[PDB]
Structure 1
Amino acid sequence: RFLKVKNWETDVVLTDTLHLKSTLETGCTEHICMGSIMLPVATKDQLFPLAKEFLDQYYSSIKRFGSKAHMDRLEEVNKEIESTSTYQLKDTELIYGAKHAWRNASRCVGRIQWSKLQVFDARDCTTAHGMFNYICNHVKYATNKGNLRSAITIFPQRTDGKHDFRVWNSQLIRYAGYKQPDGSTLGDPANVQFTEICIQQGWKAPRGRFDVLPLLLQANGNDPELFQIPPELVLEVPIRHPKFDWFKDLGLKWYGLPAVSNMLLEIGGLEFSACPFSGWYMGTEIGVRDYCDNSRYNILEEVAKKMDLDMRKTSSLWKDQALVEINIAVLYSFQSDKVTIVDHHSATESFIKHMENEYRCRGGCPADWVWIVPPMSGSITPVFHQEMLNYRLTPSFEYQPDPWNTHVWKG
């Protein structure tokens, strides 16, 4: 079976065969498409086949499929599963696995970079304090004084599911949110609930608009513990506009390191429930989503007021006007401070090249159009006109529910 995808701007047609290697379900059926739905303990029985598929992939990629090394490794994993109901990855398999989970991440526009990924093996970690230290080192390494470097830190795998390592923060660096009694919110409304948990756990809240949250870390299924990231490690950028001098007076800033900490990395059947990873920002993540979502900092009106736009009718496109200026400001501010950032035009152009390379070398590239197309100026980016096929490959990153919903409190 072959499937074709077309670019409607260029007429370049591509052929997908990689999707034949897919096993997991998308959420779609022959009768319903779920492409815009955000969210559409294992047995030996299921485990050895998952390990095998993975190691066959790995040995093919080093071009030792069917080698003595390959066969000895399968036998050795089989024996470890038999004896212990699980197994441990070699360092090389871990590195390969984490890189491929990124390569396979269909919602990620940044995947041209997939093979340059610094992997930090934290599988010897045992306590929350140890987690905190590994996470500090990740942040310092990744930040690299503004010359951002991609990285991931991988804590011990799931065992019985009663002993999970988790980072309770959804990203390593995020700002507190405080719901006021009048119903307004100070800071980031997305973090209100997490901020409340932090506070209950003992965090002393500065109660400002941009307070960096503490880390909340759970080792070995234990109750999570609070740590403050040293401020000298948190790189931040004050937001100003190249032409509008009143922009700085809005008091906006943002952190330089986007570092997703709430996902589950699955490799050869093993589940890494704490695997924080980081890259660098595409500008629209901050300037469109974080600043301009109604449910977030919501600065559109205030910026439009200062621009003296006609705010009486939507058809003045005052929201669209303010939006571009804010995104100009974010790119200008990061660039002037020499902090790595990518605009949506450049990032999408690179993804198209990545995607075409992947069809040629790999036989495909799973991609989720709904997520890949930027949240402003969609159709003036090349990805808008690119047909894409979405399917699920492993190794993979997966969403997990927030731990406060699942955690058994020990006290």
Structure 2
Amino acid sequence: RFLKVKNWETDVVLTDTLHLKSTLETGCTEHICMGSIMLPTKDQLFPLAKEFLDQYYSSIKRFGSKAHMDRLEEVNKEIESTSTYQLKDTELIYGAKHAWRNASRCVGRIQWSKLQVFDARDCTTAHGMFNYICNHVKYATNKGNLRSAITIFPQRTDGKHDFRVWNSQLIRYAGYKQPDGSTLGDPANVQFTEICIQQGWKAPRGRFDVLPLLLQANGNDPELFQIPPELVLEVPIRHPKFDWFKDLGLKWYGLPAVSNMLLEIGGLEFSACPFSGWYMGTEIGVRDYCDNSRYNILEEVAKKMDLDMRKTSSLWKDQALVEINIAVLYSFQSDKVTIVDHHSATESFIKHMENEYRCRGGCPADWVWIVPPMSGSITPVFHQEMLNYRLTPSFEYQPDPWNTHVW
């Protein structure tokens, strides 16, 4: 019930006590570990509010104070009466920053306290949503000098009036299945693109078409908006040594921005809360470019490199993977767009974990996600034991809205 984690490279042992405050369930039991599974009213609301306000007032050294008691007081009266409550600005910013601090799959949490929070709780239409998201995108992009941000739309009320961004990230490329049988563009986005054409988008039918946003205000049917083209910073991918690389015609966008998660703070649920930081190079160069079900380019790059593709044991895939990843990092750095390589990011995460252990008594961390998808054991996180558990405030996965929406 007080637990140790050991680093097997360095022999450092840390004691975790923060897990005792874990709220939600993990999916695991005493009999089965589900560590690799991607997706494992008034009465309930008052304890969630209390738990949250206690942690808030504690964080500002005023736990137990008259101002603490008066606030539980007020939120209590407000729930009783209105059956929900409204967070104060300060509470909303604290909640959002802690939802990131608590994101156990996120390697970049050393940054967690430097998060610009945009309060869009006064938004009422999808046009208003579109405006807020363009401003978020412009602020966060900052001409390539990226800054972390979140934009928080109104909280769920009765569940019939949800705000949702239908897109999974604010910026993604379209996918279209061909007469050919194959797929042009990103195969991850084929279903979403169909909904877009079906809601009226005029698809340019190219390999790298930025999808339009599909926004849902107050439970209405979602509407389509194109992000101003000049606000989507993209990077053409070249290689520092291979002049033929540019000829593949690859590009990626600078801003990773998740838009389908649910932010939960003191029992309140913010179903549209797009957030963004900056990329770790492997995300584009290993996953986006090299997954077999994504742009799947390994074979072309290997062929251009003239490697022996006859046998798996020449490690042609591995060789080409490294080159692709050198090209991503080089292209972002040349164009001065913030990016971090997986060595430097995971080293920061170990420093972060030590800080959180020391100052907070723990850091929930999901090893399956924190260890990079290439070169795992040459990053320090591979060697680091991690305990995974769920603290609130949190970001939660929620089902695709086209499955929920009644039109």
TM-score, length-normalised on structure 2? 1.00
Distance 2:160 2:406 in 1: 9
Deviations 1:70-109, CA, capped at 9 Å, x for gaps: 1110010000000011000000000000000000000000
- Give the secondary-structure state (helix, strand or coil) at the position aligned to 1:285: helix
How far off is 1:357 after superposition? 0.5
Deviations 1:247-297 (A, max 9, x none): 000000000000000000000000000000000000000000000000000
Residue 7 (str. 1) matches residue 7 (str. 2) = yes
Partner of 1:25: 25
Deviation at 1:238, TM superposition (A): 0.3
C-alpha deviations, 1:299-343, integer Å up to 9, x for none? 000000000010010001000000000000000000000000000
CA shift digits 1:369-408 (9 cap, x unpaired): 0000000000000000000000000000000110000101
Q: Which residue of 2 aligns with 1:262?
A: 260
Q: CA deviation at 1:182?
A: 2.2
**Per the alignment, in what secondary structure is the counterpart of residue 39 of structure 1?**
coil
Which of 50, 67, 70 lines up with 1:69 in the alignment?
67
Within 1, Cα distance between the matches of 2:102 and 2:377? 25
Paired residues, what number?
Answer: 407
User: How many angstroms apart in 2 are the aligned matches of 1:107 and 1:232?
Assistant: 31
RMSD (CA atoms): 0.4
SS of match in other structure, 2:68: helix
The runs of at least 4 aligned residues of structure 1 exceeding 3 Å deviation read: none
Q: What is aligned with 1:371?
A: 369
* C-alpha displacement of 1:23: 1.7
CA distance, structure 2, for counterparts of residue 401 and residue 309 of structure 1:
43
Q: Per-residue deviation at 1:183?
A: 1.5
User: How many angstroms does 1:221 deviate by?
Assistant: 0.3
Report the alpha carbon displacement of residue 181 of structure 1 after superposing the two structures with TM.
2.0
Deviation at 1:232, TM superposition (A): 0.5
1:37 paired to 2:37 = yes
Q: Separation in 2 of the partners of 1:353 and 1:408?
A: 47
- The whole-number CA distance in structure 1 between the counterparts of 2:235 and 2:43 is 51
Superimposed CA distance per residue, residues 163-185 of structure 1 (whole angstroms, 9 cap, x where no aligned partner): 00000000000000110122100
Identity %: 100
In structure 2, how many angstroms separate the alpha carbons of the residues matched to 1:335 and 1:221? 42
Instruction: Structure 2 unaligned segments of length 5 or more: list them.
Output: none
Range with greater deviation from structure 2 (178-187 or 85-94): 178-187
Unmatched segments (≥5 aa) in structure 1: none
- In the alignment, which residue of structure 1 is the partner of 2:178? 180
In the TM superposition, what whole-angstrom CA distance separates every residue of 1:98-140 from its partner, at most 9, and x where no partner exists?
0000000000000000000000000000000000000000000
Q: Deviations over 1:215-262 (max 9, x none)?
A: 000000000000000001000000000000000000000000000000
In the alignment, the residues of structure 2 paired with residue 191 and residue 167 of structure 1 have an alpha-carbon distance, to the nearest angstrom, of: 15
| CA deviation string 1:186-224 (max 9, x = no partner) | 000000000000000010010000000000000000000
Corresponding residue SS for 2:127:
helix
SS in 2 for 1:401: coil
Offset, 1:68:
1.0
- 1:159-308 mapped onto 2 (5 Å cutoff): 159-308=157-306
1:202 match: secondary structure? coil
